[PDB]
């Protein structure tokens, strides 16, 4: 079971980095402005809910940049993360005070994944 | 029997064996569906291509389950001929690698590259390749399988004969999946050694 | 203007954080984990020295929490105002111990497979295989994932081969840029 469960995470992580690895080589000015909110505490898997909530903005942010630069279809990846994020919880999301950039955002969830992907196997 | 394979991008290929007939693909957690008319191949076998999206867009996920139904007209209505609960990532088959080209030929050596076509980034590097060489003395079947247990989009062939006609082929398979099978062989790349 | 601290976590066995101070003063190091449990400020319990002068600090296994944001702080003890702090992502700083027990073995008269082990972590390490023959001016290198194997599908018996491997804590449990040192090469 956990065996089914770690593989999914590995995947989530994976195109979380596709977004990251797609916004750096890149209006990243105007893009680095939008202000996301990060969880106060992201340790257990059920915390991922705090990730689902922000996805709507994540899309509205990526559609600032047209689709030629990125090697990922924005509506798609999001559409796909959501699906992961959903199957992975199964409570209410309480947010943090400070606000972070899309980059500081992904970095944080990417890491969130790497934690659980370490602590299992 | 009713068999389908997912190409890891936006395409599900279908085979049906038992007049108008179709396959319907209904993702258990998407707001879309897709169909296509089944066309004949063998005497009593039909094939079909379900286009989920743009050629390289990622339309399905490893948590997705797509219900696959085959339907044939039965008077007024449609009849459900076959049903399957299809986990796309458990039934992977990739296109044959493309853009085969000689990176570097010598008289006793050769270096050949290829591209994987429409491979999901979810695989990262967990891929496998098989390659083989048609030398003048043998046929393709008798040609040894060259094992690359890693993602490597080139091969350096040693122990070649100068002024010798060779053909080369390579195929690809993800590590993931219970029913995943090798891709079809790539278009054979033809090349010849220096004297 | 205090020296930049560079901290590195070794095979997640312990952490060495060093700085060159010679540019004579005993600077101090203090560290804490922001936004988490035990947000208390901990004093360095183990100093590393260069010429009877503080040159770093060493944190042992139990003090190390990858995945928890690590804040380290250098202090000039003369002036409270002269302090410099760095927030660190520790999972991006892990250096694995280099690959060991390199072995080659044939699966055909012309096809080789290279294998190796890792000291602790396993699914967490990616690898770089470098090889060259007595004929090459340069290394052929090739990245390989967590199947710690490497296949060599076409080899020349008349030639003599050299293989070596180094590892990297990336990208599943961290995003480290730095590689381990090379394994002991082995020959064919
Ligand atoms: C044996 C050898 O040198 N292999 C090379 C490889 O390093 C390179 O990545 C590729 C692209 O030019 O061509 C081939
Ligand atoms: C890899 C590593 O830890 N490098 C050295 C280590 O050998 C030594 O024990 C420590 C204390 O001097 O400083 C550093
Ligand atoms: C044992 C220890 O504490 N540290 C050692 C020490 O020999 C030195 O710092 C370095 C090279 O000599 O290797 C490490
Ligand atoms: C400031 C200085 O000259 N060097 C000191 C040394 O004398 C002392 O034994 C050591 C332990 O705290 O710290 C260093
Ligand atoms: C389990 C493993 O792969 N680690 C081995 C270790 O047990 C052995 O002592 C060493 C020297 O032969 O090689 C390495
Ligand atoms: C795309 C590709 O394979 N290019 C490679 C490059 O990555 C590598 O640095 C070099 C040496 O092996 O050979 C060439």
From Swiss-Prot, chain A:
Keywords linked to the UniProt accession: Adaptive immunity, Chromosomal rearrangement, Cytokine, Disulfide bond, Glycoprotein, Growth factor, Immunity, Pharmaceutical, Proto-oncogene, Secreted, Signal
Domain of life: Eukaryota
Protein name: Interleukin-2
GO terms (BP aspect): activated T cell proliferation; adaptive immune response; cell adhesion; cell surface receptor signaling pathway via STAT; cell-cell signaling; extrinsic apoptotic signaling pathway in absence of ligand; immune response; interleukin-2-mediated signaling pathway
MF term (GO), any: kappa-type opioid receptor binding
Function: Cytokine produced by activated CD4-positive helper T-cells and to a lesser extend activated CD8-positive T-cells and natural killer (NK) cells that plays pivotal roles in the immune response and tolerance. Binds to a receptor complex composed of either the high-affinity trimeric IL-2R (IL2RA/CD25, IL2RB/CD122 and IL2RG/CD132) or the low-affinity dimeric IL-2R (IL2RB and IL2RG). Interaction with the receptor leads to oligomerization and conformation changes in the IL-2R subunits resulting in downstream signaling starting with phosphorylation of JAK1 and JAK3.
SS bond partners: 50-93
Annotated disorder: A chromosomal aberration involving IL2 is found in a form of T-cell acute lymphoblastic leukemia (T-ALL). Translocation t(4;16)(q26;p13) with involves TNFRSF17.
Gene that this polypeptide is encoded by: IL2
Protein family membership: Belongs to the IL-2 family.
GO CC annotation, single: extracellular region
Cell location: Secreted
UniProtKB/Swiss-Prot annotation, chain B:
Annotated Fibronectin type-III domain residues: 96-195
A biological process term (GO) from this entry: cytokine-mediated signaling pathway
Disulfide-linked positions: 4-14, 21-72, 36-48
Sugar-modified residues: 11, 33, 111
Coiled-coil stretches: none
Keyword hit for Signal: yes
GO cellular component entries: cell surface; cytosol; endosome; external side of plasma membrane; interleukin-2 receptor complex; membrane; plasma membrane
Chain ranges on the Extracellular side, renumbered to this chain: 1-195
Keywords: Cell membrane, Disease variant, Disulfide bond, Glycoprotein, Host-virus interaction, Membrane, Receptor, Signal, Transmembrane, Transmembrane helix
Positions occupied by motif WSXWS motif: 182-186
Cellular location(s): Cell membrane
Annotated GO MF terms: coreceptor activity; cytokine receptor activity; interleukin-15 receptor activity; interleukin-2 binding; interleukin-2 receptor activity
Record family assignment: Belongs to the type I cytokine receptor family. Type 4 subfamily.
Protein name, entry field: Interleukin-2 receptor subunit beta
Organism: Homo sapiens
The encoding gene: IL2RB
Part of the full-length chain shown: 33 to 233 of 551
From Swiss-Prot, chain C:
Glycoprotein listed as a keyword: yes
Motif range (WSXWS motif): 179-183
Gene Ontology molecular function terms on file: coreceptor activity; cytokine binding; cytokine receptor activity; interleukin-15 receptor activity; interleukin-2 binding
Keywords associated with the record: Cell membrane, Disease variant, Disulfide bond, Glycoprotein, Host-virus interaction, Membrane, Phosphoprotein, Receptor, SCID, Signal, Transmembrane, Transmembrane helix
UniProt membrane topology term: Single-pass type I membrane protein
Glycosylated residues, chain numbering: 16, 20, 26, 101
Residue ranges occupied by any Fibronectin type-III domain in the UniProt entry: 98-188
Any single Gene Ontology cellular-component annotation: nucleoplasm
Function of the molecule: Common subunit for the receptors for a variety of interleukins. Probably in association with IL15RA, involved in the stimulation of neutrophil phagocytosis by IL15.
Disorder association: Severe combined immunodeficiency X-linked T-cell-negative/B-cell-positive/NK-cell-negative: A form of severe combined immunodeficiency (SCID), a genetically and clinically heterogeneous group of rare congenital disorders characterized by impairment of both humoral and cell-mediated immunity, leukopenia, and low or absent antibody levels. Patients present in infancy recurrent, persistent infections by opportunistic organisms. The common characteristic of all types of SCID is absence of T-cell-mediated cellular immunity due to a defect in T-cell development.
Subunit field text: The gamma subunit is common to the IL2, IL4, IL7, IL15, IL21 and probably also the IL13 receptors. Interacts with SHB upon interleukin stimulation. Interacts with IL9.
Name of the protein in its database record: Cytokine receptor common subunit gamma
Species name: Homo sapiens (Human)
Gene behind this protein: IL2RG
């Amino acid at each position: 079971s956990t065996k089914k469960t770690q593989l999914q995470l590995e995947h989530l992580l994976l195109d979380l980095q596709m977004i990251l690895n797609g916004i750096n080589n890149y209006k990243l000015t105007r893009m680095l402005t939008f202000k996301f909110y990060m969880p106060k505490k992201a340790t257990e898997l059920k915390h991922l809910q705090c990730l689902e909530e922000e996805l709507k903005p994540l899309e509205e942010v990526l559609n600032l940049a047209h689709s030629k630069n990125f090697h990922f279809d924005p509506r798609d990846v999001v559409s796909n993360i959501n699906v992961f994020v959903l199957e992975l919880k199964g409570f209410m999301c309480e947010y943090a005070d400070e606000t972070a950039t899309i980059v500081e955002f992904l970095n944080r969830w990417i890491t969130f994944c790497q934690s659980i992907i370490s602590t299992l196997t | 029997q009713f068999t389908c394979f997912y190409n890891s991008r936006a395409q599900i290929s279908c085979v049906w064996s038992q007049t108008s007939c179709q396959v319907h693909a209904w993702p258990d957690r998407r707001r879309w569906q897709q169909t296509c008319e089944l066309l004949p191949v063998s005497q009593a076998s039909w094939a079909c291509n379900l286009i989920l999206g743009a050629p390289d867009s990622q339309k399905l996920t490893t948590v997705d389950i797509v219900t696959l139904r085959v339907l044939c007209r039965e008077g007024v209505r449609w009849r459900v001929m076959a049903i399957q609960d299809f986990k796309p990532f458990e039934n992977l088959r990739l296109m044959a690698p493309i853009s085969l080209q000689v990176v570097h030929v010598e008289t006793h050596r050769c270096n050949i590259s290829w591209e994987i076509s429409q491979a999901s980034h979810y695989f990262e590097r967990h891929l496998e390749f098989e390659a083989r060489t048609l030398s003048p003395g043998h046929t393709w079947e008798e040609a040894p399988l060259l094992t690359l247990k890693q993602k490597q989009e080139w091969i350096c062939l040693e122990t070649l004969t100068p002024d010798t006609q060779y053909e080369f082929q390579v195929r690809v398979k993800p590590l993931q999946g219970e029913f995943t099978t090798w891709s079809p062989w790539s278009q054979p790349l033809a090349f010849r050694t220096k004297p | 203007p205090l020296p930049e601290v560079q901290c590195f976590v070794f095979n997640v066995e312990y952490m060495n954080c060093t700085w060159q101070s010679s540019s004579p003063t005993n600077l101090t190091l203090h560290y804490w984990y922001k936004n988490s449990d035990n947000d208390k400020v901990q004093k360095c319990s183990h100093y590393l020295f260069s010429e009877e002068i503080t040159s770093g600090c060493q944190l042992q296994k139990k003090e190390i929490h990858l995945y928890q944001t690590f804040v380290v702080q250098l202090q000039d003890p003369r002036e409270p105002r002269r302090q410099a702090t760095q927030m660190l992502k520790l999972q991006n700083l892990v250096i694995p111990w280099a690959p060991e027990n390199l072995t080659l073995h044939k699966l055909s008269e012309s096809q080789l497979e290279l294998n190796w082990n890792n000291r602790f972590l396993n699914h967490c390490l990616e690898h770089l295989v470098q090889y060259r023959t007595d004929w090459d001016h340069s290394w052929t290198e090739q990245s390989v994932d967590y199947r710690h194997k490497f296949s060599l599908p076409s080899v020349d018996g008349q030639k003599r081969y050299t293989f070596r491997v180094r590892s990297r804590f990336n990208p599943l449990c961290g995003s480290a840029q730095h590689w381990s040192e090379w394994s002991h090469p082995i020959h064919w």
